[PDB]
Design a protein around this nucleic acid. Sequence first.
RNA 1: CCCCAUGAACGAGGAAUUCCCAGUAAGUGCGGGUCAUAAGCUUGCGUUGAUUAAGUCCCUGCCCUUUGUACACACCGCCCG
RNA 2: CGCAAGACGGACCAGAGCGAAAGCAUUUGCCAAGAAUGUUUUCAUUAAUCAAGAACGAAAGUCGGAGGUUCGAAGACGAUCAGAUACCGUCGUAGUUCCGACCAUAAACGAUGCCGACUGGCGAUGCGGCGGCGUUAUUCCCAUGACCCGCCGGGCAGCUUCCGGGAAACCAAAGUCUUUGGGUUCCGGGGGGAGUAUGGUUGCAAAGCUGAAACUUAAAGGAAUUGACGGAAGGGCACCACC
Lengths: 107, 215, 64, 136
Amino acid sequence: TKKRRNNGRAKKGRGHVQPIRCTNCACCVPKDKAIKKFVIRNIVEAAAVRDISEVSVFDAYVLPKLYVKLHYCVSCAIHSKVVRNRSREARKDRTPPPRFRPAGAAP
Amino acid sequence: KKVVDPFSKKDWYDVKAPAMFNIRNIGKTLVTRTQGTKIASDGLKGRVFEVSLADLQNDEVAFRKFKLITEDVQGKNCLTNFHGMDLTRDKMCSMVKKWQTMIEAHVDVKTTDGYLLHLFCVGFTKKCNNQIRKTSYAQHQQVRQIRKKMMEIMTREVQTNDLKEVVNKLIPDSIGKDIEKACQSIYPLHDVFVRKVKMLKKPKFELGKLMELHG
Amino acid sequence: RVQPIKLARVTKVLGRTGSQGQCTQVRVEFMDDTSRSIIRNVKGPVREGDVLTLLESEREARRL
Amino acid sequence: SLGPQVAEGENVFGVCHIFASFNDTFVHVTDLSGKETICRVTGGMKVKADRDESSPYAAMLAAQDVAQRCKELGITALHIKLRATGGNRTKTPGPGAQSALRALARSGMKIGRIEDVTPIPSDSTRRKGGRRGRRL
RNA sequence: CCCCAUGAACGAGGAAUUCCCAGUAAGUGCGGGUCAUAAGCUUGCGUUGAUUAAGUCCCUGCCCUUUGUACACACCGCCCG
RNA sequence: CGCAAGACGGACCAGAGCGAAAGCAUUUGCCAAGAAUGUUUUCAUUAAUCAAGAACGAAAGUCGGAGGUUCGAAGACGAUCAGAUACCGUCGUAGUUCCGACCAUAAACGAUGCCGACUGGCGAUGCGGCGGCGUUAUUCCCAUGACCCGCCGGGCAGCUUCCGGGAAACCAAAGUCUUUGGGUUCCGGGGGGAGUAUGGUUGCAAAGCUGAAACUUAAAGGAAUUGACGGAAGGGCACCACC
């Protein structure tokens, strides 16, 4: 019995789209299907900047970021709890959320 | 069998930047002691160092980089010339946001001194405040006319003027602003930079201009 | 590259980690200079006001 | 040993260049041109077990053996280009890449700018080994 | 049961594994049951009396949601040449 | 640091577009083409849907070249296992790519014929038109332009709804079906035997289309409900569990 009215993930008006390769299995999944998560993070990290700020010349400077847009196939994104089975009811919610924006004092 | 640790043999040169930049003492670099069987200037001469325009100017030029290539050597001094401007990675990655149109135009053009350049520009549509569509794409018509405008300027702005004025130009970012003026009549746009410049063909030699620029 | 030894005093007991449940979270007032304050993981039984002897003195953990 | 110059202020400059993948970590200073090396050493050489090739602690040890000869030959300071396997490979940083940077800054050399240089490709050449994914 | 004699292995226990938070673990004797006789047992009792978590769900076990299931004599279940 | 080859067009990129469907993301030019809209243009029934016939048709495969970068159906290797011809590592094949022919099939799924009308709320978005003594952007005012708000078409959809449907899951079409009748086309009549035998046909080949029976058997199957159980996710609780 059909589970998601969206089937896989959003197509509707196509019949085709190029496939991407999972960033973990190196699998293969249509781009319409496939969990995608952006990933922006500082070159340095948590602790470093203090030795990174002290050891550097330059008066401040002020840190690059690495930017990487991830793709996972279903099994990887589940496996690693990027996404987690939600009850017959919760599945319907596209939305997104948490309560503060975890950036240093989160979990 | 123990032998010839090599630094204890190597010699130092002070990398010198062109005049349009500001301060000009880039740093230092090591080559092997010249032996008749060798030209330390040989292993020295087409080297290219990439320095941040911020170190080069002193600033807001955090993003932006210049490639400086060693064009000749004079006793512990090595006089470099413009070789390129790119952006880095972080900056470029940071502009590229969903829900907005990314517009790129590039043109290849010969300068007043011969140099052949391929020179890129970039821009992104902007939502304007009392918008309440969340996205803010542009129409295909728009981008085609915007690109033409970017291209016309870039050829117009490089044809007249030598490698130095392009340089003098790219520092205060006058192209950027000019694009902004020619395009707002057509569609919003947030960001906008000539984002890269690629040296394609070099003219022949001439120490004359090089020194004019250094010295 | 390095060595020193650091005295730190327990400000607030956070809770317990380790899946076994045998490491206690701690917050430390930096003893030699109060204008510092960091999170460290413990082996033993720890209670407010008693003192750690930090080797690493950066680091600052979390789970595990 | 030696030194480009006495300079009770500014520091002689080279390039730091760290490739962090998983299963190893390369640290690497070279002359700002790149053409000429100076002291390499990986996170491999300073531990034995293959499994531990890439661990941050090894990485530390390596950045320490590197910073040594760096400040032992002439470089007083260094600008860094951190990298991942790249290509169609993972595109995320390996574990002892951070550790190496903390180790050299802590060591007491000087830092200047940063960019990432992993090779990202206007995508293609099909990624390795096949459609159904590494199954495991 | 005693008396003598003969005076063994065992000089710290691998794979594994039980049980336990305060009079508790452990040492230590006693009494009751069996009983004519017969305690290395069980079954309490006082005596001497610590080390050690003070918690958590990792392993294990069981119940808690959510979820999947061709199962329902219910995974010790229902399978291919 | 340069250069060569072949591959491919990332980020931007969406419950977003177009195309009959299969399918389709670099720039620019040429070539014809396709829908929507606007339209007090033109014709006067031109029209709906279809045996037979026919166009297109992802992938693999096949014919001959180009080409083989990348990865790799087979093989040979290293591990793992009681066994491992596998998964896992490595080497690596036809092949992937491209041209001219074949081939006609994919859970080619929206698993939902096509065409017409009628029955219900709200807000998005691609696009066209229309309206505003609304905003912002300019010159001396402009013509600009992008927006905000509303209106109307026709897109792909979504959301919420005891209309109504359905066995339910669900469904604004799967509604207007016992109160069973708008047009037309196709396929099915328990499950296995079987897309099998056999004849015809198409194909170079691999195979494709049409398509039985004898016999076999009382359930095959669907949906929802609930446990049991999981080397699925959050859960807990106990020294018969750990610490």
